[PDB]
């Protein structure tokens, strides 16, 4: 394990690492990076690296832009490809302002304050995320398509052509980068796949979500395919979620487990669910962040469009797996892989902590098929829906005292101005569906 | 003029009419028809015509569907094409249930009740509509396209090729059916046109908007072109409205005119504007009936997306033109040519009548550019906007007691259930624009 | 008969095609030949009675009962080809259930509101591929049989039969029309009413020919099977 800069510099000389790539994200989830020649790396440890902070917060506003990244040698990781030139590695850091205080617009910093709030109450958060993607073909120019690589279904042994070898090479690359995958499997849609990661501390796991996406996309490109994390690239088949499994720990023990209760779940696991239900509508804009996210959040598929919890029903917005003991987890099913994982995990934590502190009851479970009910019956059960498009998500989050305080004003207001712009652009587009339905009709 | 059924039977014999077409609309505005041989017509006058009422009200419920159409001779009008087979006419009438009561679900009936309501207070309503449309090319299979016939602009003398003759032939066909056109011109967008109806009695004018649509379409089709009444066929240029000029009359005098006021407008005109503004939000789903309607109701073009009234400003939702005396009129600018004119004018008449009854002051005019203002300025001014998409317009109508009582429950619920279905179909569609924005990004 | 070739020849000579297929296109409506019928005696409409609550005569109900009794047994004649049973599937204008009604427009037998000398019974299941001499004769015999033997039609069905369960309709005793040609053939081969109405020569010829048409179609491997199974198996 690397802990000091001497470890990393020793590892760079020994493994012949020639390139050191930084790894962060902007407010909106986009993965960002610049390349450091391993010759510069010793000065970067000693003095940090000046960079333009508009890489994170965008250019919209006159605000301080001269940020410094301090490298965390414990986050140093060698990437699973070997150019002729020598090896490449990624590394992360903490972003500071020129005055020496931390930049509060860095999404990773927002996760750290959420982590700090939990440790104040004695807990830490573990997450094991389940990531879905499509494996599509490239066209003749090497550019992405939505063309299928198989027609398999849920848990099929598919593909069995050369796409079989490409899928295996993706799993191998992540495994031998130290990810420790639990399992992977073909998902419901044709060409759709899932990878289950091991449970780790939320910070370590969010860092790995960012690495995962560009590692997979690059490996696929170099074998002649494309890996897509679009929430819904195709109509009439399943969309792709990023199911987020979580538990709290204290004193070495799973806070959610209670051997003595009838269901073996503690009262604080119920309060954590109640606080998630109380606030999830207020940050669907964060877990489901693009226009297409709301083409997956429609009835008919895996995706959960109603607010409820359950143990017996596999489909609810929040589900409780049968697992007990230290593997007791809660599973929130609405996020998709477009979400900025630092922000998604941060708000998930704050909501559950607020539930625990304020003793928020989650109500009774919903063990029935909600989509089979009628809107009268769902009203009788107090079953609200998630926001149905990006705009309704924008308006819910814009009013949320909980989201503004958990994110800070900078991130909260940049996120909303950027998303509102995205919505105003889309809501004016005249789509071919409209010409097909209307052109001959009117 | 056609006054008696003997007038129509003589004209049929004298002018060699071999087919009579019925003309009506369904709940949602689609134009409906069946053909009657001239040999069957005298029997048709004597006993009415039985037909299936699913043509108006649809199939979705088990409800009485054997209807009787009683032919109104005074609506007999010969169509402006002469097949070698012989002449063709259209005719309208009144729909009855098998017990002998009028069918309340026919939109034209809905209009006739509104006309009765105003006559109970002394008034009858004139309308002069201004119909915008595009003229497009046909592809090789004679299929509609959105391909342009000119690149002209506002009031240009355009087109000047073979399409100049088609445009003149459209004006000629309507005028010599007896429409009495006032003026036609090229409108702002490429290939866009407008024809200004004669200010006339609302019932007969609504009959004319239906005739106008298929006469124009059929004339253009037979010349190799396509006439499009889509609100917004093309992103980035003007959409097509149906602005609706209207006035009330009592005892043959225009009650919107008062020579002894500074504006030379009576107070009842102001109460009528006041009623229209009070309810326009609640029936935007009727004036703006399809998903495409809300691609036109966006800022930047001729379309009014803000609730206000003005004399000066051409931007207003309600504009009062300079004309005074007998041609004093109020112009409502939001409707598009896909609406059902029977319902759209009826609701307009009922909203304004409710203003005169309740003496609803319209507030102050708005003489500024509303698009140039900030939200707090519009908020300070109390300037509200129209529904931003069809779903919002559905939700607004569904809550409106005023629209329900004016339309009648059968029409009210049928209309909303069908628009709710169209929206649910649209909202799930993954559009090409989403693949362009996200496929390579995510 | 005249109509079909007249319409076809007119359309061909204008550059178009007039098609009388039951179901030329999946996922839209098919084409039927609804057959409205009146019976007359002494100059008067047998089905009209000014004194009954619905103004239908008793023989009208007996006529309906006869049609309901036998219709399953000559679906093979009113719905003659393999493609006919792609129209007789739920979801469209086609009536796939055996029932009568005045209120529901989609019942197998419908009574329009018209009374008087124009009182009529609409039998909705036939399609334009049927021999109309054979269809109209079988409808006439069946109605006549209902009147001679006083066959009650039972209760009308005023609700949506599709929106009921398989048990719900069995609770109502509502039967289906045959699901395919082979099934319609087997219903007709065992019918004495159909055999006597057509005569033995017609009965046997018709059945042997349709049995050959089905034996051909059932062995075809359709492109839908490749799309569903080639990758799968």
Residue numbers in the entry:
A (entry chain A), B (entry chain B): 6 to 447
C (entry chain D): 215 to 447
Sentences from the paper on this structure:
The enzyme, glutamine synthetase (GS; EC 6.3.1.2, L-glutamate: ammonia ligase) plays a central role in cellular nitrogen assimilation by incorporating ammonium into glutamine, which serves as a carbon and nitrogen donor for the biosynthesis of nucleotides, amino acids and lipids. Here we describe a structural dissection of the archaeal Methanosarcina mazei (Mm) GS and its regulation. Like the Gram-positive GS, the Mm GS active sites are formed at the interface between two subunits in the hexamer and are comprised of five regions; the E flap (Mm residues 303–310), the Y loop (residues 369–377), the N loop (residues 235–247), the Y179 loop (residues 152–161) and the D50 ´ loop (residues 56-71), which is the only active site region contributed from the adjacent subunit. Like other GS dodecamers, the Mm GS dodecamer is formed by two interfaces; hexamer and inter-hexamer interfaces.
Strikingly, the structure reveals the Mm GS dodecamer is sandwiched between two GlnK1 trimers. The α1 helices of Mm GS form a crown-like structure around a large central pocket at the top of each hexamer. The GlnK1 trimers slot into each of these hexamer pockets. T-loops are typically disordered in apo PII structures, but in the Mm GS-GlnK1 complex T-loop residues 44-52 form a helix that fits snugly into the GS crevices. In addition to hydrogen bonds, the GS-GlnK1 interaction includes hydrophobic and van der Waals contacts between GlnK1 T-loop residues Ile48 and Tyr49 and GS residues Ile83, Pro85, His181 and the side chain of Arg87. The interaction with His181 requires the rotation of its side chain and is the only interacting region of GS that undergoes significant structural changes upon GlnK1 binding.
